[model samples]
Target chain A: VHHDGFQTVKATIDWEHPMFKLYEKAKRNGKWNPADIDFSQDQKDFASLTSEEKISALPLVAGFSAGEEAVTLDILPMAHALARQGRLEDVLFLTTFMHDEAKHVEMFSRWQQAVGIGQMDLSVFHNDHYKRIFYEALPEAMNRLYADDSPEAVIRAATVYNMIVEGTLAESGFYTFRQIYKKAGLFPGLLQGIDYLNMDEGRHIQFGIYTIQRIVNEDERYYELFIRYMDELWPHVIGYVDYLTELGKRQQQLARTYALEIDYDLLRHYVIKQFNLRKKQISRT
Target chain B: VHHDGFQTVKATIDWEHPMFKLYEKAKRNGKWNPADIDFSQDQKDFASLTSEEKISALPLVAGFSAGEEAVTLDILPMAHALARQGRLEDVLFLTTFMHDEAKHVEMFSRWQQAVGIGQMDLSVFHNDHYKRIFYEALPEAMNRLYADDSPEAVIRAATVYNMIVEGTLAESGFYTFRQIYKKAGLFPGLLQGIDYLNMDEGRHIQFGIYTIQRIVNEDERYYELFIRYMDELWPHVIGYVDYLTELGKRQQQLARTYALEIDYDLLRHYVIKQFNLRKKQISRT
Candidate 1:
């Protein structure tokens, strides 16, 4: 009963498939090592930060660190599901996908240590919105693949993982980091590492969209299912923005001449805009 | 209740630890692309081979193909277990470990296609011994981690996968490939790919040994457990080699001046020698 694409490559691989193309692109783009980044400037940048500056950046930093590890831990099941269907190219692309996630985990970890946030209890940065998405939803959608790997299940997993978690949440984290650190002109090392991570996620999001498109085209009900799931997840999404706003409000409570203000409206708009863009991409397919 | 090493990198990772060191080594050494190898010459060589030579070689090629895919599919559970324990460094190393296995599968599949063997039902090459270890034992031990990730479970999984699958069977596969292809001065592309895979496995096997040592040092019962599992696995190990000899004997039945005679005694000797070498390495640790 157990068969693999390698047993019959001619039949299994559509050489022109986007998954295979993504795999080739991954082999080229996803080879960067986490340890090679220089975080000495980040350490210096953190050392010189104002209290509000430090506090404003902690949510993005802590959120990314946890989010990256969660994705790394959760992605293997999706790869397993693809392998079960003998989709070798998709599974192969995921090997790099998982590796990139792990590398992102280490890169963030390395940055945390360099900036001296490694010892702090960063878990406080994760609110209920974060927990519901990562703790409950991500693993719930992914682990379900072990028992039921139908198109509905796979699309559900990808939507929760690639679309919501990565496309919205992690993308917002990156946007916040750039707005804060880039505007401040500090933490070049952290920014560079994040730039690499963002590129990796670009590929991941493409795979996610492709997966959704492929499945929805197969069974139109899956398109509705994807919509229904995203609709169900929208509250948590808005809650996550509210949680970010609350963090900013707490910083504003510590307001002074040096207060760092994040435009929560802009962040929420970016998340919504990104979600629409993903919808368009999937629809175009 | 859900936590990860990235949350507290300071307490979770030892920079000087062997796992960390292995992770470092993996980044440096494990970046070979399977597509870079030029299999054009292999196509010519395979085309020129006699039926006897081709049939003799099919078992090894088919075995490695199926074996590589099985390992790739089976390895994720081990990574999940480590992530559950927040062993970020080890989990990071496995990302590369898994990518390397996927690359190996692609390489073998590419070879089969280039040589006009891709569509064959290569599953026939897998004997009962192969199925027991890969189809049954590997996944059974690994999937158990989703429920029980105790040290005993980890060690059992590692022993079945790393010790027996990669360390013994895969090592013997490399040995057999070299004996047949290398001594005959053929299949340069395949050999180069195997050389890279062997290097990757060297890292994987080291991680396995380090894991076993770390656990055994923690609780000596795991040491006995390792030995006991190895003892139980010995029969199948022998059965696998006997199966190999059977393949060679079938070739001899169609014997002539051009029959390729494999030295089964030497292959058996190599397997035993590898098993002892692994035992000694674990014992010394």
Candidate 2:
């Protein structure tokens, strides 16, 4: 049904939308209070468990928390910048990211508190060595996109945020969570939250990639910045892979041999392939 | 007094005749408390005051809660890294930073609680843009120093932490607090905390710069990585400057005039000249 120049069109609207109903149901069911979960037994059991069990269990929750923190600190700022630049529609769409991330923080913190594991000290998990590479080095590379004042900067920044950080790093972490969930179906709620987050992140990635392509098609200057930004960020991106590998090793030593089961080779290969595809797309533009 | 490996020289130290005690005594005699002061009336009067008057009436209270958050999020991790790496001596010294920062937070929070303004949102006072650029991005730059596996990596990392980030950025922020203290006589306890923090930070910078220089002298790879790191971080640093400028402008608007009188030009000159000096020093090494 189309309307133009005061012509009227009628369309049926579904007030009883399935997804809307699902949201309502989820909201009702998801209102589980953290205080209801008793964690003394879990803590006692955790203390009794072998060091390996402790490490394996630690990273699932920690990884979720870390992933959430990274997105909150990195991705949201770029979105805020986009909003401030007067991209009204993008601003509206991106506000969901802020909500999602805040929920991530809440969900992860709740998980930690419920499990009786002390609130994950981000400082302990993110060693200076890792922080220097991922947090310090990556942003410098990413900020190259800012040289151009076009929408391309947002796209490039979002790509780095969505594709590299989320797609590669966080997705790999989520795979580990999947493995743990397979072992024990206790954290169904947590898994559900991650699934929802991943769904949103997938859209973020697609939108980001599409935006980058559009920018490249529109102007060569943005293409150059995109290439330069990618090149600058690549080393640090690769370094993140190595850090994850090292972290995997530490987790293996501390927990059950889950690190070995989690095939980083596959993850790395997938990431490389994704990068190649992105490169090809950019070249075509 | 001088001490040798096998011989020690001792000097008499007077505990009672400390310089700070006199100032403390004077403050004790003054015995001013928020309870005795009509804050609402004062605030009303304050609202009508000129810019110079307002600035002059600004308090000595350092923003310690923010400092504590920074320490928790930033400094403690550095300490933990040292501890994990088995650099216990370094860990011990870094602990002072943690203590000072935490104390600063406590003291500042207390002062805020005493003043009618204690209920103010910490985020409101924080310049989000400045925080993202300096506090957030600087860590990523520090990560680059860790990627190199040379023996000097630790020293280089420490140097970046102490000299570049802490020395330049944190010190600049501290001076802003001092300016407030100089204008307004509020929160002398917090000012003392800042003074202690400045002392510790001074030593940290000295040790950091010395360590980097020593590492550069011994290892060309470490030296090159350090140079590369600085070059890489240049843009984030520039972004920080821009953020500060915007912050200064916003503060001026909000306060109806430039209260802090944040000298953007001076900040630029200091940062640029310092980096230039560092570069020259590295080259000479």
On DockQ, the candidate that comes out on top is: 1
- In terms of TM-score, which candidate is strongest? 1
> What tens digits encode model 1's per-residue C-alpha lDDT throughout B68-114?
87788888788878877867778878888888888888888878888
Best by lDDT: 1
Q: Please, what are the lDDT tens digits per residue for candidate 2 over residues A26-114?
A: 32333232223444555454556565666555544554565554454344344435433434234333433433443454455545554
Candidate 2 per-residue lDDT, tens place, B150-223, comes to 45556555545655566555676567656544454434554555565565555556546655666667766677
**lDDT (tens digit, per residue) of candidate 1 on A107-196:** 888887888877777777778887888778888899888789988899999999989889887887788778766876778988899899
Off by over 4 Å in 2: A1-48, A57-64, A119-122, A127-129, A132-134, A137-148, A180-189, A250-260, A277-283, B1-285
| Candidate 1, chain A: TM-score against the reference | 0.92
What lDDT does candidate 1 reach at residue B96? Answer: 86
Native-contact fraction for each model?
0.28, 0.00
Candidate 2 interface RMSD, angstroms, 1 decimal: 23.3
Docking quality band of candidate 1, CAPRI definitions? acceptable
| Model 1: how far residue B52 lies from native, Å | 2.1
